[PDB]
């Protein structure tokens, strides 16, 4: 497995396992799962009431010092009853390390904004309002950031189609850029590309 297969880092795997045990037993009030992947990245799956007590911990504890908010992310998975999955990628420049902090919400539950911890989030969760409809309470200036001003809907939700519902054109009658319902000159062709054979037996799920 030398030339093609990626060389596994077992030292970082063991160290992230130990630090995941560390974070899991310092904060048992909110930490639900702790997992380390094959390419040695750590996820602390927590409760959405624990946005501030976890992220202020990792930013300020002397063994964590996760000073840089790299990436704040939402993931829409509609098969769950809390469909949206909020992801915090954190960087500790002191310990040369990266951690992930994951939690959940549905359309209606407000997630606690983390601008009192990381001001870097001031736009990102704003984007999560603009794209996913996840409301963030106690946000300073929460509004849209990436879509058009009169845009109705949250685009990156998976029940929202690829093309929207309205499209624009300039209209010479009213001398104005107007929105009609969307019509395509060619339909976006859907490619059913899933092979019917199980590619990975290691990720096999148990049946019902």
């Amino acid at each position: 497995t030398r030339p093609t297969v990626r060389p596994r880092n077992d030292v970082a795997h063991k160290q992230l396992s130990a630090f995941g045990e560390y974070v899991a037993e310092i904060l048992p009030k909110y930490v639900q799962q702790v997992q380390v992947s094959c390419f040695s990245e750590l996820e602390i799956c927590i409760h959405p009431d624990g946005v501030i007590p976890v992220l202020t911990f990792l930013r300020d504890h002397s063994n964590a010092q996760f000073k840089s908010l790299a990436d704040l992310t939402a993931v829409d998975i509609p098969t769950r009853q809390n469909r949206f999955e909020i992801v915090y990628n954190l960087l500790s420049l002191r310990f040369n390390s990266r951690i992930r902090v994951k939690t959940y919400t549905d359309e209606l539950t407000p997630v606690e904004s983390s601008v009192s911890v990381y001001k870097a989030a001031n736009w990102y969760e704003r984007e999560i309002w603009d794209m996913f409809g996840v409301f963030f309470a106690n946000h300073p200036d929460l509004r849209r950031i990436l879509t058009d001003y009169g845009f109705e809907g949250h685009p990156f939700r998976k029940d929202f189609p690829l093309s929207g519902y309205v499209e624009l054109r300039y209209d010479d009658e009213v001398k104005r850029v107007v929105a009609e319902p969307v019509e395509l000159a060619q339909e976006f062709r859907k490619f059913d590309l899933n092979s019917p054979w199980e590619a990975f037996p290691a990720y096999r799920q148990p049946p019902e």
């Binding site: 990626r6 094959c38 990266r98 992930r100 001001k119 990102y124 990975f200």
Partner: protein
């Protein structure tokens, strides 16, 4: 003209890239990344390629790694020529714009000779690169790099010692180090503020731990130190390019797994397994094992990350794009407190923003 509040309304180039990535395969999602940071094409290719190769549990050959680093440093020369020359254009010196776009034109010719398109190459692919270097390309890269030092020298002659340039950059846009980290700044926006951090040193990828270069660090967090950091990153990019030309290895340029990389056309048209693999790669695509990763590299603007979520199929389930310019343009609101309209333009210059990756 004393600025009281800046509200950057963006989304004027938001095209919904990362929802279009959800409906196309990985090879079809690769040319979206050339169009995010449209002056840093192969750096975004390299970031997405490292993300997919991290999820695939495979690695490139050595030659493809050195090609990735060589053209990533050519890409870094491209981006810092764009940064410095448009920053001097926006302050008012429109001359080294024209002086350095000839050099940038020649590096676009290097892209055209190696991939066939001058800007968006679709070249650094998951599995290495697409196509091997044409003969005599490295000799012309050497002929470029041998002479590019004098071009940096005459740019630095025009602007660095100049007092009009120091009047527009030295007390302008000062960023403290704790507010740099707490705003998610990355790259030169940290390094102008004196923070010792660079992702090619601290979290090393393909063969950057095998090259030797120095990481320029500022002292005052202003536009002038970020200018000097960009110029010295062009210097050290020429240094890495010399080390990559001297230490290029022979061998292949794709990973030799034909269930990831496409087989060669001379053996696709002869072998049956290679034709089946060519068919199923250019129609279905390779199945990525399920899971999420955050792969961040040192793009010439800073930490460029792909948070890639795969669901076992041959298409990404989710592809979040962390751009440096997003957090930098968030920090524009603090950086313009206590300056003027003729300084907010220089702060937009010193935050090297390309709005494709800011807007997706």
């Amino acid at each position: 003209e004393m600025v009281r509040k800046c509200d950057p309304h963006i989304g004027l180039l938001h095209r919904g890239t990362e929802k279009l990535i959800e409906y196309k395969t990985y090879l079809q999602a690769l040319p979206y990344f050339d169009r995010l940071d449209y002056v840093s094409m192969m750096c975004n290719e390299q970031a997405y390629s490292l993300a997919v190769e991290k999820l695939l549990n495979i690695q490139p050959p050595p030659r493809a790694q050195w090609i990735r680093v060589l053209f990533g440093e050519i890409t870094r020369l491209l981006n810092h020529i764009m940064a410095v020359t448009t920053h001097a254009l926006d302050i008012g010196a429109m001359t080294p714009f024209f002086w350095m776009f000839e050099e940038r034109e020649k590096m676009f010719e290097f892209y055209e000779r190696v991939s066939g398109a001058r800007m968006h190459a679709a070249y650094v692919r998951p599995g290495g690169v697409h196509q091997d270097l044409p003969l005599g390309l490295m000799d012309d890269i050497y002929e470029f790099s041998k002479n590019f030092s004098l071009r940096i020298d005459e740019l630095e002659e025009m602007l660095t010692n100049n007092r009009i340039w120091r009047n527009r950059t030295v007390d302008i846009g000062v960023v403290t180090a704790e507010d740099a980290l707490n705003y998610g700044f990355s790259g030169v926006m940290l390094r102008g503020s004196g923070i010792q951090w660079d992702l090619r040193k601290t979290q090393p990828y393909d063969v950057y731990d095998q090259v030797e270069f120095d990481v320029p660090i500022g002292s005052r967090g202003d536009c002038y130190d970020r200018y000097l950091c960009r110029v010295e990153e062009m210097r050290q990019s020429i240094r890495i390019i010399s080390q990559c030309l001297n230490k290029m290895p022979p061998g292949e340029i794709k990973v030799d797994d034909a269930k990831v990389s496409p087989p060669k056309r001379a053996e696709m048209k002869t072998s049956m397994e290679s034709l089946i693999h060519h068919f199923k790669l250019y129609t279905e695509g390779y199945q990525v094992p399920p899971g999420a990763t955050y792969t961040a590299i040192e793009a010439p603007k800073g930490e460029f990350g792909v948070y890639l979520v795969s669901d076992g199929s041959s298409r990404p389930y989710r592809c979040k794009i962390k751009a440096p310019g997003f957090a930098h343009l968030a920090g524009l609101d603090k950086m313009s407190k206590g300056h003027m309209l003729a300084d907010v333009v220089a702060i937009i210059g010193t935050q090297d923003i390309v709005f494709g990756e800011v807007d997706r």
